[PDB]
Amino acid sequence: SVAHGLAWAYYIGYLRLILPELQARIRTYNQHYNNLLRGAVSQRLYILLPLDCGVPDNLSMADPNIRFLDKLPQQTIDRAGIKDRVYSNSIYELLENGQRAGTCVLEYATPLITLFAMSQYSQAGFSREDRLEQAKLFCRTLEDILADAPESQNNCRLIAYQEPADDSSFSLSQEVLRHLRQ
Amino acid sequence: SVAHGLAWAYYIGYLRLILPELQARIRTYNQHYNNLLRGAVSQRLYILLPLDCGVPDNLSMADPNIRFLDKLPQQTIDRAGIKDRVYSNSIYELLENGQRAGTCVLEYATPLITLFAMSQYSQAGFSREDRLEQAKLFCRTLEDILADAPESQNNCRLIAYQEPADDSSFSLSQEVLRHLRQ
Ligand SMILES: Cc1ccc2c(=O)c3cccc(CC(=O)O)c3oc2c1C
Ligand SMILES: Cc1ccc2c(=O)c3cccc(CC(=O)O)c3oc2c1C
């Protein structure tokens, strides 16, 4: 199964690398730019999982109620298969009814890009129906990995959603706010 | 298939983001530091694919006839799912009888880390035998992808190899040089 392997790859090649020092990075940021923030970023990493596998080029453009505010200070990673790579995470403001309702570190799950690409390329032998099935499977597998994972406790949140196409009353910031509220 | 999706993920999420500007980065290196390197690094990316999926902490330590020389100039990435990310590549010295015999951009394919991990974790439901079969299928699938991929014509080379178990005296250094010499 591609989703099974993708979930493990996403965990092994990203999440178990980024999550250990994430809560430290967020506390550090909440220390030094506190005068600037007049608030506090939340502790967890919020990962967007659109089931249609539609990943935009820029998250800032994706919803007018989600707004880029700041970068976390970087993290260079020193491991096998990874040498001197610079990882950065972005911090977003979430608006509700014109007002700031939350601030969190937020990003899309990259393997959805691969699932989407696989459905476009004929050499991959992957249909658009295969795609939705695999995306749900990817979400559930990853969910299960993180439940039992030493690195993943209390510091990572999966936000999976299906977007109606295309009455489009959907709000991405509403969906994130629903998880943030806890 | 796990390998099928890992190969596509490696192409979609690394190789096609890195290959397009590789030669230019190398060409550019062969100038600014031509006086420092006193030679030339070859222009392709050499990807090591150990079938036993053993990927070392430091390649430099996998064979002592493989020594780290220098880093390439950095590339920043502007794609979807990957804003403000800094990628570097490494140049290695290959030794033969104590002297330099070649210079190349060299790295292990990361999905083999994932294949290895999956064989170690119960939750992955993935055996040692599953691992070797999938590693072979990964190489074949990746080959097929690169053969017809726009970004991957003539700037990439796969070095798949199987370590004998009888003699613990196989030479990665020599294997890489065997490809290099053409
Ligand atoms: C741009 C892009 C696209 C797809 C993947 C991916 O499938 C994928 C799968 C497993 C692990 C990674 C590593 C990462 O998210 O940095 C992956 O990264 C991808 C990236 C960076
Ligand atoms: C450290 C590590 C381990 C495993 C993968 C991986 O499986 C994997 C699979 C597909 C794509 C990527 C992205 C990359 O190699 O930068 C992947 O990256 C990994 C990395 C960076």
From Swiss-Prot, chains A, B:
<feature type="binding site">
    <location>
        <position position="14"/>
    </location>
    <ligand>
        <name>2',3'-cGAMP</name>
    </ligand>
</feature>
<feature type="binding site">
    <location>
        <position position="110"/>
    </location>
    <ligand>
        <name>2',3'-cUAMP</name>
    </ligand>
</feature>
<feature type="binding site">
    <location>
        <position position="9"/>
    </location>
    <ligand>
        <name>3',3'-c-di-GMP</name>
    </ligand>
</feature>
<feature type="binding site">
    <location>
        <position position="110"/>
    </location>
    <ligand>
        <name>3',3'-c-di-GMP</name>
    </ligand>
</feature>
<comment type="similarity">
    <text>Belongs to the STING family.</text>
</comment>
<feature type="binding site">
    <location>
        <position position="110"/>
    </location>
    <ligand>
        <name>2',3'-cGAMP</name>
    </ligand>
</feature>
<feature type="binding site">
    <location>
        <position position="14"/>
    </location>
    <ligand>
        <name>2',3'-cUAMP</name>
    </ligand>
</feature>
<feature type="binding site">
    <location>
        <position position="14"/>
    </location>
    <ligand>
        <name>3',3'-c-di-GMP</name>
    </ligand>
</feature>
<protein>
    <recommendedName>
        <fullName>Stimulator of interferon genes protein</fullName>
    </recommendedName>
</protein>
<feature type="cross-link" description="Glycyl lysine isopeptide (Lys-Gly) (interchain with G-Cter in ubiquitin)">
    <location>
        <position position="83"/>
    </location>
</feature>
<feature type="binding site">
    <location>
        <position position="85"/>
    </location>
    <ligand>
        <name>2',3'-cUAMP</name>
    </ligand>
</feature>
<feature type="modified residue" description="Phosphoserine">
    <location>
        <position position="88"/>
    </location>
</feature>
<feature type="binding site">
    <location>
        <position position="9"/>
    </location>
    <ligand>
        <name>2',3'-cGAMP</name>
    </ligand>
</feature>
<feature type="topological domain" description="Cytoplasmic">
    <location>
        <begin position="2"/>
        <end position="182"/>
    </location>
</feature>
<feature type="modified residue" description="Phosphothreonine">
    <location>
        <position position="76"/>
    </location>
</feature>
<comment type="subunit">
    <text>Homotetramer; in presence of cyclic nucleotide (c-di-GMP or cGAMP), forms tetramers and higher-order oligomers through side-by-side packing. Interacts (when phosphorylated) with IRF3; following activation and phosphorylation on the pLxIS motif by TBK1, recruits IRF3. Interacts with RIGI, MAVS and SSR2. Interacts with RNF5 and TRIM56. Interacts with TBK1; when homodimer, leading to subsequent production of IFN-beta.</text>
</comment>
<comment type="function">
    <text>Facilitator of innate immune signaling that acts as a sensor of cytosolic DNA from bacteria and viruses and promotes the production of type I interferon (IFN-alpha and IFN-beta). Innate immune response is triggered in response to non-CpG double-stranded DNA from viruses and bacteria delivered to the cytoplasm. Acts by binding cyclic dinucleotides: recognizes and binds cyclic di-GMP (c-di-GMP), a second messenger produced by bacteria, cyclic UMP-AMP (2',3'-cUAMP), and cyclic GMP-AMP (cGAMP), a messenger produced by CGAS in response to DNA virus in the cytosol.</text>
</comment>
<feature type="binding site">
    <location>
        <position position="85"/>
    </location>
    <ligand>
        <name>2',3'-cGAMP</name>
    </ligand>
</feature>
<comment type="subunit">
    <text>(Microbial infection) Interacts with human papillomavirus (HPV) protein E7.</text>
</comment>
<feature type="binding site">
    <location>
        <begin position="85"/>
        <end position="88"/>
    </location>
    <ligand>
        <name>3',3'-c-di-GMP</name>
    </ligand>
</feature>
<feature type="region of interest" description="Cyclic dinucleotide-binding domain (CBD)">
    <location>
        <begin position="2"/>
        <end position="182"/>
    </location>
</feature>
<comment type="function">
    <text>(Microbial infection) Antiviral activity is antagonized by oncoproteins, such as papillomavirus (HPV) protein E7 and adenovirus early E1A protein. Such oncoproteins prevent the ability to sense cytosolic DNA.</text>
</comment>
